[PDB]
Design a protein around this ligand. Structure first.
Ligand SMILES: *[C@@H]1O[C@H](CO)[C@@H](O[C@@H]2O[C@H](CO)[C@@H](O[C@@H]3O[C@H](CO[C@H]4O[C@H](CO)[C@@H](O)[C@H](O)[C@@H]4O[C@@H]4O[C@H](CO)[C@@H](O[C@@H]5O[C@H](CO)[C@H](O)[C@H](O)[C@H]5O)[C@H](O)[C@H]4NC(C)=O)[C@@H](O)[C@H](O[C@H]4O[C@H](CO)[C@@H](O)[C@H](O)[C@@H]4O)[C@@H]3O)[C@H](O)[C@H]2NC(C)=O)[C@H](O)[C@H]1NC(C)=O
Ligand SMILES: *[C@@H]1O[C@H](CO)[C@@H](O[C@@H]2O[C@H](CO)[C@@H](O[C@@H]3O[C@H](CO[C@H]4O[C@H](CO)[C@@H](O)[C@H](O)[C@@H]4O[C@@H]4O[C@H](CO)[C@@H](O[C@@H]5O[C@H](CO)[C@H](O)[C@H](O)[C@H]5O)[C@H](O)[C@H]4NC(C)=O)[C@@H](O)[C@H](O[C@H]4O[C@H](CO)[C@@H](O)[C@H](O)[C@@H]4O)[C@@H]3O)[C@H](O)[C@H]2NC(C)=O)[C@H](O)[C@H]1NC(C)=O
Lengths: 207, 14, 207, 14
């Protein structure tokens, strides 16, 4: 039969009022012969009717995939409401049901530290700017970089890692032309998490 | 993003 | 029926002649009624008879788990030989077969950089020593820390992260009492990977 | 670990 997977919003989207957070229900292994799929959505048991269901799409393995998207309220997701997706298709015995909500546990505030590139990395044309983010719970977090008002995109961030006290840490790495570092340009690491004031903090890094 | 709207959101969350 | 999972040696164990690398075949979902399991092992198609099979062990979900361990030669694993585990049990139609070998792809040498703790972290009783390891392929790697001849154990390391050029990076974090950093004690990050000379390099970090 | 044995191992790998 088909299979159902249910996905939370992006951390940033739940935390920042400029964004629109959504919960996503993906039905896979839908057969060519019966591809009709219905969705029903619920919030703390109460049915809601604002979901938008995509048109089915064929796969490179002869099967279909159907995706439904539900827009949610930031405050609801943050305050622990539960979201249920129910999926209906003839090739099932009965409807499949899946529920999600924000990770549980006592929140703890991230500490954010910027680390300049090593002296030994200066033999290179590009250098690494580092942002250490530690001591946070739950693990849902977003990290970005800017310079001079504008986003910097040439970064990669590790997944959250469990630390010895049961909190989480990660590191983000921004790669920049050595020119820009040595010219004295100012960079910033921005961190979004539920246990920060405004859900947001920014730390600078420069020569 | 708009920082004053973010601050109002966080202050009003409940 | 039962299910079979086949696991490679620890990266360090394949790289360091002081260690003994082994390949591990785990059979799960073995039933109470038929718990008899046989193992056969092969290296590049040729059967070998030095594996050591553990006694079956019951699970907290009414099923058994049986584990067989094969000791391998460092140079063989490193030079790309293939290891096959074949599992036999009555509740199977036929024997299950699984094969593994070292990740493929052109090796590239890790660059290793040590980063001292942030000034802003000094308000704390413990501080973070950082080791950035970048530009390596394949992702199999081991990282450790020492001080004054002896291992330091209070570290955590992120998983390897794919970088924009298709190489990998990670960061390791050693947490030390601020005392020890400020007293001028010398720390080292040690990195083991196939594309280093001796499979090993060490970088120092100190005030 | 023994560094001189590691070096001999790496030099002799083939
Ligand atoms: C025939 O072909 C089809 C399709 O190719 C196959 O379908 C696949 O089947 C797999 C096995 O059944 C299934 O595996 C599960 O994967 C999930 C994780 O899936 C995510 O990550 C994958 C990459 O690593 C992606 O391929 C998936 O697409 C999925 O990605 C996420 O999608 C989200 C929804 O769009 C998205 O979030 C939203 O994004 C938008 C904007 O883009 C908004 O921000 C919005 O707010 C969000 O809500 C995520 O960003 C996106 N993430 C990405 C790309 O990383 C895994 O969790 C699950 O794990 C189960 O099983 C494990 C194993 O034991 C268990 O531990 C777990 O508890 C759990 O039960 C499965 O591994 C594939 O996902 C699926 N392919 C799909 C959906 O495309 C068929 O299987 C093939 N038929 C066969 C083989 O017979
Ligand atoms: C009833 O109960 C049993 C047992 O509790 C259940 O059995 C479980 O079933 C799961 C689903 O079938 C199965 O999931 C697979 O997991 C593997 C990854 O497993 C590793 O990591 C897990 C932790 O995240 C551990 O639980 C596992 O034990 C395993 O750990 C590794 O074990 C290695 C062997 O000992 C060890 O390496 C050796 O270690 C020694 C020294 O210790 C030496 O160094 C030696 O050199 C090494 O060779 C590793 O260190 C150790 N790693 C650890 C601890 O992290 C996963 O890969 C696999 O993924 C499959 O499916 C996904 C999903 O789609 C797919 O993407 C993949 O391609 C792949 O096909 C499965 O998710 C569990 O592992 C298993 N439990 C076991 C083995 O204990 C039953 O399922 C239950 N019955 C039910 C539910 O009906």
């Amino acid at each position: 039969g088909p299979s159902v997977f249910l996905f939370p919003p992006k951390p940033k989207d739940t935390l920042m009022i400029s964004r629109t957070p959504e919960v996503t229900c993906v039905v896979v292994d839908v057969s060519h012969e019966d591809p009709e799929v219905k969705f029903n959505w619920y919030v703390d048991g109460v049915e809601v009717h604002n979901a938008k269901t995509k048109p089915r799409e064929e796969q490179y393995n002869s099967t279909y995939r159907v995706v439904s998207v539900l827009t949610v309220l930031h405050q609801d997701w943050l305050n622990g409401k539960e979201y249920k997706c129910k999926v209906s298709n003839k090739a099932l015995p009965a409807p499949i049901e899946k529920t999600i909500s924000k990770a549980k546990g006592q929140p703890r505030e991230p500490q954010v530290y910027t680390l300049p590139p090593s002296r030994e990395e200066m033999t290179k044309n590009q250098v690494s700017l580092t942002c250490l983010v530690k001591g946070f719970y739950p693990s849902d977090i977003a990290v970005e970089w800017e310079s001079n008002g504008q986003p910097e995109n040439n970064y990669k961030t590790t997944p959250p890692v469990l630390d010895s006290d049961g909190s989480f840490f990660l590191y983000s790495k921004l790669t920049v032309d050595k020119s820009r570092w040595q010219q004295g340009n100012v960079f910033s690491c921005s961190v979004m998490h539920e246990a920060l004031h405004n859900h947001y903090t920014q730390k600078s890094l420069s020569l | 993003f708009n920082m004053x709207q973010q601050r109002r959101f966080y202050x009003a969350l409940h």
